């Protein structure tokens, strides 16, 4: 099933995952971290690693969590095998390069956070109340049939805050409740060229 | 065989290559440039494109020439299908992200130029005298069996200048003459952990 360690590993410390959702916190690591198969999750406290100093998500859909002031994980060959970029943590903030990720997530944050170079058919899922305006800017917004999939996904009432979607024509919102007891989510949308808004889900908005 | 256009295209202007080595100069392009098959070459005058605003090298081994103050082409999804990164031009200079390229080239430059995040088995070929110290820093220099392949390749005597290869243990230099008439190349190497230097080729060093 996997193992999760809530404490940030030593910069000197090697970690090896297996099948199943393993989950750790890394700092400026000096060692070659492997995550194995299954849907894994590494949270980084610093954007670039050290010495050398790598982390491979391995097979499966793996989440990389940026607890940092900006990221560009696609550029760094130190990170590989990740599919989802989540911006969440007490230091999580600022401009984040979405390039090369197939999904996006957002949690509690230190301040306003921006996703750049977001490819087509890439959706954002918000999982907890962030701080400050969340801007999404697509790889190419210029067309007139631009579709974005926003998801809100929580057990309790979620105050998603402001998300800005400049140049998107159809905005799809899923409001998702993870438990059996009903709630109502809240969102400021700023989508000045949206012609359609479609809401799906099983919670209020 | 291909076509080559030495003038920089209009930012509004669409270009389509075929098979064979086509070759152009781009600025902050607004359009979707395709290069087709064969070994193509785009020179860019500005690091990020515009509007949107893309250039795909297509099939084959294609060169991207950075006539700019720094690059990170791997990060930008606007560029794709390139295999070789060359730093050459009257504005070419500064820090350049080698990530995702399988070969490197260097020509005449505006000033000191640095290749970062250079993967293993990636070699540099210098084609003309650059300006200022050329630093190569590898993706991972930390091991004790590090091999780098430097090539010097010119018709006439080539003053390669200073190249710095911190953390490389075996430095291989090819000194290559492209014509039948003999010459002697010059190089300052700064390789403070090299145990071996091997020189091959058909010109003097
Ligand atoms: Ca695993
Ligand atoms: Ca995995
Ligand atoms: Ca994977
Ligand atoms: Ca990556
Ligand atoms: Ca609920
Ligand atoms: Ca649009
Ligand atoms: Ca819009
Ligand atoms: Ca071509
Ligand atoms: Ca090509
Ligand atoms: Ca590329
Ligand atoms: Ca190609
Ligand atoms: Ca000669
Ligand atoms: Ca070394
Ligand atoms: Ca050395």
UniProtKB/Swiss-Prot annotation, chains A, B:
The S-layer is a paracrystalline mono-layered assembly of proteins which coats the surface of bacteria. Probably acts as a physical barrier to parasites and lytic enzymes. It comes from the Bacteria. It comes from Caulobacter vibrioides (strain ATCC 19089 / CIP 103742 / CB 15). This is S-layer protein. It is found in: Secreted, Cell wall, S-layer. The calcium binding of this protein may mediate surface attachment by ionic bridging between the S-layer and a specific membrane-associated oligosaccharide. The gene is rsaA.
